[PDB]
Amino acid sequence: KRRTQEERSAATREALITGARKLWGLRGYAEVGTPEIATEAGVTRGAMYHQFADKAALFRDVVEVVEQDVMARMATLVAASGAATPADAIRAAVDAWLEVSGDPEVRQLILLDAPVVLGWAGFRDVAQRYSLGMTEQLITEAIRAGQLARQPVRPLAQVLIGALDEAAMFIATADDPKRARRETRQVLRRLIDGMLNG
Amino acid sequence: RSAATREALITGARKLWGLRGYAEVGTPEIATEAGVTRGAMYHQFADKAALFRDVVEVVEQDVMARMATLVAASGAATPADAIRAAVDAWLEVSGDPEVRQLILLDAPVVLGWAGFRDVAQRYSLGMTEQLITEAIRAGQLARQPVRPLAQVLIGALDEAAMFIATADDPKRARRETRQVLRRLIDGMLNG
Numbered sequence: 418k419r420r421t422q423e424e425r426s427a428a429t430r431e432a433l434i435t436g437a438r439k440l441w442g443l444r445g446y447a448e449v450g451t452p453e454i455a456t457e458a459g460v461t462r463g464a465m466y467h468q469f470a471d472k473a474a475l476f477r478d479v480v481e482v483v484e485q486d487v488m489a490r491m492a493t494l495v496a497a498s499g500a501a502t503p504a505d506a507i508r509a510a511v512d513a514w515l516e517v518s519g520d521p522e523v524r525q526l527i528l529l530d531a532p533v534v535l536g537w538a539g540f541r542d543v544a545q546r547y548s549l550g551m552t553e554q555l556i557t558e559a560i561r562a563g564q565l566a567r568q569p570v571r572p573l574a575q576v577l578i579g580a581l582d583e584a585a586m587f588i589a590t591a592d593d594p595k596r597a598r599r600e601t602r603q604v605l606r607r608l609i610d611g612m613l614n615g
Numbered sequence: 616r617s618a619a620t621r622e623a624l625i626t627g628a629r630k631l632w633g634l635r636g637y638a639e640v641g642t643p644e645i646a647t648e649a650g651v652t653r654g655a656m657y658h659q660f661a662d663k664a665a666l667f668r669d670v671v672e673v674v675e676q677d678v679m680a681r682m683a684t685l686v687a688a689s690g691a692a693t694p695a696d697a698i699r700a701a702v703d704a705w706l707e708v709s710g711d712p713e714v715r716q717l718i719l720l721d722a723p724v725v726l727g728w729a730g731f732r733d734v735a736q737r738y739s740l741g742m743t744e745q746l747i748t749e750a751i752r753a754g755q756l757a758r759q760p761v762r763p764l765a766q767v768l769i770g771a772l773d774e775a776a777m778f779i780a781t782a783d784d785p786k787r788a789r790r791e792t793r794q795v796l797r798r799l800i801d802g803m804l805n806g
């Protein structure tokens with residue numbers, strides 16, 4: 418039955434993404450091959466290849482589910498902060514990015530593996546796809562509330578995403594990441610407090 | 616002799632890749648531009664990417680010299696004004712269609728992530744840290760962790776160049792980007 422195989426193939430796709438996220442999150446992309454991931458998912462190499470043409474193609478789908486969870490957790494952390502003004506929402510969002518990007522799995526897959534496997538253009542495209550809307554919305558609300566000078570929203574959003582992604586990559590490869598994270602949080606908080614009217 | 620061959624090849628490659636991009640010019644065309652045989656070129660450079668590595672170093676050296684000249688010519692009177700002029704200088708130099716082609720489009724792809732990040736950090740981190748350190752010395756910027764602030768500003772400036780380079784409307788993207796970076800610097804100096 419075609420339907421049976423198609424349901425099992427959809428299940429196989431989920432099992433492979435779950436399996437690869439777990440093993441690559443622990444050991445890194447370079448240290449785990451597709452045969453080990455197929456065994457972990459409990460599926461044949463033939464079923465795996467039917468879903469993902471090669472190792473990089475499975476890695477792209479892992480990045481998507483991780484980035485989905487990163488954005489959901491940033492939104493959850495911002496809501497949990499109880500920020501009462503757009504300026505406080507921005508302060509909470511900056512703190513939320515340093516907390517989420519400090520998760521060892523996000524560090525390994527997004528900050529260390531993804532720039533290498535996706536390349537610069539591919540990494541930029543993913544970061545923008547997931548974060549540009551949230552960032553533009555925070556900026557737009559701050560401007561509407563009179564807490565931020567009216568200025569071009571998309572360019573400010575892109576530049577701030579670049580600053581924050583470079584901050585997280587610096588923390589990811591620091592000799593002392595705990596110190597790097599605390600010092601980065603201080604310079605970002607000073608910069609935001611210099612820019613915001615509130 | 617070695618150095619002379621290498622100089623001719625780097626000059627030739629920078630000229631032709633600057634014009635047409637890395638993908639559109641092969642090594643045999645560069646060897647002819649330099650006036651050396653393919654044999655002499657392969658003696659000096661393992662492959663196309665290895666020649667490109669050396670071309671990126673001399674292009675990054677030219678970028679730095681052009682930014683330092685533009686900053687000196689600006690008549691910046693204080694470290695804070697030097698920062699503002701350095702940001703304007705980066706937008707001008709990275710808007711050169713040749714710098715766009717070699718550094719913003721070709722280098723990330725040819726060198727890969729790790730290689731490209733190592734080069735861009737080696738050229739950008741030291742000038743940035745020095746600009747911050749002088750502003751703090753002059754009382755124009757709060758004393759705070761210098762390297763972390765330098766990495767944040769380099770992220771902002773790298774993204775600014777990439778956003779302008781790939782924009783539907785680069786002239787508009789450049790005007791708008793210059794305004795948001797001027798507001799960001801005035802915010803940093805106010806923090």
Ligand SMILES: CCCNC(=O)Nc1cccc(C)n1
Pocket residue numbers: 480484487514527531540541543544545547548578581582
């Ligand atoms: C593979 C691309 C990873 N970059 C990414 O997720 N960027 C990001 C997301 C939310 C918030 C911020 C500041 N940055």
Ligand SMILES: CCCNC(=O)Nc1cccc(C)n1
Pocket residue numbers: 675678679705718719734735736738739769772773774776777
């Ligand atoms: C994507 C741009 C990479 N930056 C680079 O390659 N060099 C550089 C030089 C001076 C200043 C800056 C910001 N960068």
